[PDB]
Design an enzyme around this catalytic site. Structure first.
Site, short mmCIF file in Angstrom:
data_model
loop_
_atom_site.label_atom_id
_atom_site.label_comp_id
_atom_site.label_asym_id
_atom_site.label_seq_id
_atom_site.Cartn_x
_atom_site.Cartn_y
_atom_site.Cartn_z
N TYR A 1 0.04 4.54 -2.40
CA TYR A 1 -0.07 5.92 -1.86
C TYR A 1 0.92 6.85 -2.59
O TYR A 1 0.50 7.95 -2.99
CB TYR A 1 0.13 5.94 -0.34
CG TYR A 1 -0.88 5.10 0.40
CD1 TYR A 1 -2.14 4.87 -0.13
CD2 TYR A 1 -0.58 4.52 1.62
CE1 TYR A 1 -3.07 4.09 0.53
CE2 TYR A 1 -1.50 3.74 2.29
CZ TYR A 1 -2.75 3.52 1.75
OH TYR A 1 -3.67 2.76 2.40
N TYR B 1 -13.09 10.78 0.49
CA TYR B 1 -14.21 10.56 1.42
C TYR B 1 -13.76 11.02 2.82
O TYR B 1 -12.53 11.11 3.06
CB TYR B 1 -14.67 9.11 1.41
CG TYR B 1 -13.80 8.21 2.23
CD1 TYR B 1 -12.61 7.72 1.73
CD2 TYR B 1 -14.13 7.89 3.54
CE1 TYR B 1 -11.78 6.91 2.49
CE2 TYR B 1 -13.32 7.09 4.32
CZ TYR B 1 -12.14 6.59 3.78
OH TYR B 1 -11.33 5.79 4.54
N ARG C 1 0.86 -1.22 0.00
CA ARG C 1 0.00 0.00 0.00
C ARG C 1 0.88 1.26 0.00
O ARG C 1 0.39 2.30 -0.47
CB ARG C 1 -1.01 -0.01 1.16
CG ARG C 1 -2.26 -0.84 0.87
CD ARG C 1 -3.48 -0.57 1.73
NE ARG C 1 -3.22 -0.15 3.10
CZ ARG C 1 -3.02 -0.98 4.12
NH1 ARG C 1 -3.02 -2.28 3.92
NH2 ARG C 1 -2.80 -0.49 5.33
#
Lengths: 69, 262, 262, 68
Positions: free
Chosen positions: B70, B92, B66
């Site tokens: 990113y 979000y 991850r």
């Protein structure tokens, strides 16, 4: 028609308070099918995404980790 | 070029700030990370120039750290800013709460001499206080990322409301899987048992994304956590194991006792 | 009658959620607690039927326990709901974050058989993460009311970002004064010295209320807090005194070590 | 003053015009030299004077740390 209804309902406090009074009446009045209304009343979000044609779209919402620097 | 990072909140269309919506409206380009296709359609109607950051998560069973996802998101955002675009990042929730991409993009943009800022948004924790009728001020509040609690030394205050975020990936050390295992969650239960009894009632909370949707508020004993159905958006609330007790030491320095409290 | 409690955020006009503004617009009556006259004018233009809750704080040097102020605010809101009015409570920030009046009014309204709910908003802490460029997930976060930290037994994790809210009234036990004294703050400094050195850099933070206004971000050694200029809206941020350390016990149970972390 | 602050808070276009050239935007929306000076020196008290609020009273503490 699903997406148009949800977008109006999420933003409009008058429609929100009409909806909370009578969910089925408001959903019928905005054209939602019997199956869509059933999906809403049973809290089946996966079927609603099927019926809107969207969920197929991949949504992973993790934007951080706990492993440090 | 310039960068503004905004949040869209958790609920479709209505939980965005008036100002944050105006930034999306007037952007040259929007980089989005939104919970569902209804949210994606709402955004696209606001501003049709959208690049979906979802594409940078591992696809089709690929092994991807991850940290790389990113980096690739931050780089995509900065390429639009470097090109001269008035760039908005529409994430979000709150763009800076349990979210590295916006802080990293703003640090990098400032270092390269571009105007960059973050507009606060409504996070999942903000939704939880409202949905559960809990004030974090009542006995205090602590938040940790669940894996960070397992991998490093954190000591919870058991008089507070304790939140473990990203509970669904608790103990997933590789940053390459989308969920943890039952055995990892059992080790978390044993760890928490230092402060919380095994029959201590905990809450699995998920904020609703659609206006027709009820939030998930599932109450269960801590012992039952490793058998629970969890989703990437799940938060574990651990309410207080103890009532507030008087700090006689500090009251004495203040020259008062409990009976003097208004 | 019905009750909806909304937040207006900290910034004038633009930091309210789209849905929360629509609730204010369509209300029969609005009970307000807003930061300034610009915010009051903005609200009054949205909906002219406004009762200003500010009237219930102590006036002209009167001795009044804030518990009585809050009770009177809750009773005024409930009188409109009981009469049959579609009632909105419009508070600054988030109506349920370090704010008892909305939680109390929603509890009482439900107990009397009326529809009542809380819409989340953007709090001072949500503004702080954005303004300081800090992720509360980075090393985790703890929040306490400053006086509750002094009067009751709370133990901070010094690897986390620690927030003490209402620092301006820290140790004001009567709930009848609007500010504390430098002697009470010196006792707080001595208490915090159990975890934080006296030369530890802390931040006095105040979110801006006007779009032309910069937030207050004042950095000072902890030792200097009792001489600092504080306002009711001030929050004290205490950054980590230690870096994260590896939890060898749990890593072993997981069968991994630091070198295995993604 | 109030009309300008309300528009500026809500309108991202005006916000980005303002941040490019605060004095030019403020002058174009009629702000006096004294009002602009108050903004540029961060004197929120004088701005409230200049908007005339007959000292509008604003205490915003809505919780306590005494429990119960």
């Amino acid at each position: 028609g699903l997406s148009d209804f949800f977008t109006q309902l999420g933003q409009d406090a008058q429609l929100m308070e009409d909806y909370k009074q009578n969910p089925e009446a408001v959903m019928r009045a905005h054209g939602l099918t019997d199956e869509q209304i059933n999906a809403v009343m049973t809290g089946d979000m996966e079927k609603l995404k099927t019926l809107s044609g969207d969920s197929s779209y991949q949504s992973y919402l993790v934007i951080s980790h706990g492993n440090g620097d | 070029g310039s960068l503004v990072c905004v949040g869209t909140g958790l609920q479709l269309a209505g939980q965005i700030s008036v100002l944050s919506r105006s930034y999306i409206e007037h952007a040259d380009i929007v980089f989005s990370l939104l919970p569902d296709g209804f949210s994606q359609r709402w955004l696209t109607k606001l501003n049709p120039n959208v690049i979906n950051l979802q594409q940078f998560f591992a696809q089709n069973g690929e092994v991807k750290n991850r940290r790389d996802t990113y980096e690739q998101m931050v780089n995509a955002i900065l390429d639009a800013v470097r090109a001269g675009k008035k760039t908005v990042c529409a994430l979000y929730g709150h763009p800076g709460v349990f979210a590295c991409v916006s802080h990293m993009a703003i640090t990098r943009a400032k270092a390269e001499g571009f105007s960059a800022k973050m507009e606060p948004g409504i996070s999942a924790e903000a939704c939880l206080w409202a949905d559960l009728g809990i004030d974090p001020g009542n006995s205090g509040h602590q938040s940790f990322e669940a894996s960070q609690f397992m991998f490093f030394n954190h000591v919870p205050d058991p008089t507070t409301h304790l939140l473990l975020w990203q509970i669904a990936i608790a103990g997933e050390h590789t940053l390459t899987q989308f969920h943890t295992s039952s055995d990892r969650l059992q080790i978390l239960v044993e760890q928490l048992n230092q402060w919380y009894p095994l029959d201590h009632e905990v809450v699995i909370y998920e904020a609703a994304n659609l206006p027709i949707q009820a939030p998930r508020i599932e109450r269960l004993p801590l012992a039952n956590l490793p058998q629970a159905h969890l989703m990437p958006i799940s938060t574990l609330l651990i309410p207080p194991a103890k009532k507030l007790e008087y700090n006689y030491a500090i009251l004495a320095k203040l020259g008062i006792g409990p009976e003097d409290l208004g």
